[PDB]
């Protein structure tokens, strides 16, 4: 339905970006994790390889050390994060499906960065409330990546603006939702796509008016909105 | 005379319009919006950095805590003003452009923003300025951040100077690396002869940058394509 679409004007340009600039810079275990995942039935949930390099560039430019990832799946962006962080970096990875994670776990292990990862098999919302209860100022995160159930993004935001340090970054994936967010009405979507589509329009509008953060909506992948905490 | 000026890399004008009106304009500094609306009246307004790309550059600058930057290709100063507003109050920018009169169009808005003091505008071709910067720069003065948005067929020449003028871990950004999507094909019909030279140089630069061990890169399909390079050694 929506997964067949690109935000760029042609698949030729997207493949040009992937082949010229993405794959030649892809870590060998990241390539292996993607190629196994591509044969999985839910391979459409995979974060694009060009977005992945953009994620690690942010992580290194901002010198992130402690990050949280919501929505792991087979672990492409998680492995991308663990490779970008220094060897003493630490990641809190939350996903409901442990089996999805164990698909990519051997490649995280072969990369030697499993020690940076604390995987939590849970729904994300209770974990964040739990983290709110037992965290103080020097446990705050530098970086957060939200890539899970779309209709819960606004709930994650209310908790992540407190679990991320001042000056830290929160990133929301699929904010352009295959272009469908550009219109108030959109024909012929299945109810789950329409729920997510309406949730992103409210989220994009809300985040543009949120005095707690600066934002930057980036037209990469399916849309990523970078949020930097102000206070 | 340039044919690709109005071509979008996104799939529809409405999607770009949505991004600008939802996420770009509501977060645009009033003097940045003032400068853009004046520039869009000007002849070569096509050279203006898109507003959604402006907030991306600003976001990069604050996250990486840049304090000393260099800007190659100023025009009326949209990305320059974007940089000056993002940098700390004691920040420093070296801005280079052949055209001083273009800069003076946006200089009133840079002044009303209170950030002119951070800017050292140099009216010159960039290559001679970079070559003399190489002579008199100690490793304490290396720039954190370089934005290249000038003559496209010179990007590779600038690259050899900027890998030495930017600190290790610093960022070098190349604008227009997608050239309106025309880089996706070996040949592209009906371009200005100057347009084609730029199209061929970006294809060479994109392949070269992907194999350059001195930097890690990420090509971002925002605006007309931005390639962030991070110096490794
Ligand atoms: N409520 C919830 N709590 C935690 N994880 C959830 C969740 N709802 C959905 N998810 C998970 O979020 C994932 C989204 S796909 C994420 C892709 C991954 N970031 C990559 O790099 O490819 C799915 O694996 C799903 O199991
Ligand atoms: N060789 C050269 N050295 C320095 N500047 C040059 C140059 N060749 C072209 N330029 C300048 O580079 C500019 C490119 S347009 C740059 C737009 C600007 N960065 C913005 O934010 O809108 C033009 O103004 C042109 O005068
Ligand atoms: Ca489970
Ligand atoms: Ca996603
Ligand atoms: Ca001149
Ligand atoms: Ca440009």
Author numbering:
A (entry chain B): 9 to 239
B (entry chain A): 7 to 239
Original paper wording:
Amaryllidaceae alkaloids, such as the Alzheimer’s medication galantamine, are complex plant secondary metabolites with recognized therapeutic value. 4′-O-methylnorbelladine (4NB) is the branchpoint intermediate for the entire amaryllidaceae alkaloid (AA) family, and therefore was the target compound for biosensor generation. Since norbelladine 4′-O-methyltransferase (Nb4OMT) from the wild daffodil Narcissus sp. aff. pseudonarcissus, is directly responsible for 4NB production from norbelladine, we chose this as a starting point for development of a fuller pathway. Furthermore, LC/MS analysis identified 3’-O-Methylnorbelladine as a minor component, indicating that the wild-type Nb4OMT enzyme was not highly regiospecific.
To better understand the mechanism underlying the three beneficial substitutions in the Nb4OMTE36P/G40E/A53M variant, we determined the structure of the Nb4OMTE36P/G40E/A53M variant in complex with S-adenosyl-L-homocysteine (SAH) at 2.4 Å resolution. AlphaFold2 predicts that Lys13 forms tight salt bridge interaction with Asp155, Asp181, and Asn182 in the enzyme active site, while the experimental structure showed that Asp155, Asp181, and Asn182 instead coordinate a Ca2+ ion and Lys13 forms hydrogen bonds with the backbone of Tyr186 and the sidechain of Tyr194. The experimental structure of Nb4OMTE36P/G40E/A53M provides a basis for the improved thermostability of the enzyme (an increase in Tm from 52.8 °C to 58.4 °C). The A53M substitution inserts a larger hydrophobic methionine inside the hydrophobic pocket formed by Trp50, Tyr81, and Tyr108, stabilizing the active site of Nb4OMT. The E36P-G40E double mutant shifts a glutamate from position 36 to position 40 and thereby preserves the salt bridge interaction with Lys118 while proline capping the alpha helix. To better determine how the A53M substitution affects the substrate recognition of Nb4OMT, GNINA 1.0 was used to dock norbelladine into the crystal structure of Nb4OMTE36P/G40E/A53M with SAH and Ca2+ already in the active site (based on Fo-Fc electron densities). In the docked structure, the Ca2+ ion positions the catechol moiety of the substrate adjacent to the SAH binding site. A sulfur-π interaction between the catechol group of norbelladine and Methionine 53 may also restrict the rotation of the catechol group, thereby reducing the cross-methylation of the 3’ position and improving specificity.
